[PDB]
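I would love for you to help me understand the pair of lines that follows before we discuss the fold together.
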Amino acid sequence: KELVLALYDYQEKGDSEVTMKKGDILTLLNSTNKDWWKVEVNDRQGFVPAAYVKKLD
């Protein structure tokens, strides 16, 4: 934890980004930036758009 829900699909478009599918449950690594959050998807980690993931309570 903490976990986030992928609200939308996101295809990585750079070396520090990562790909995710709508509905995936990702471990949130870092949400300090307003635009890009660091998440783990299984064996991959990297940044996705903050608008596209929802913090789970």
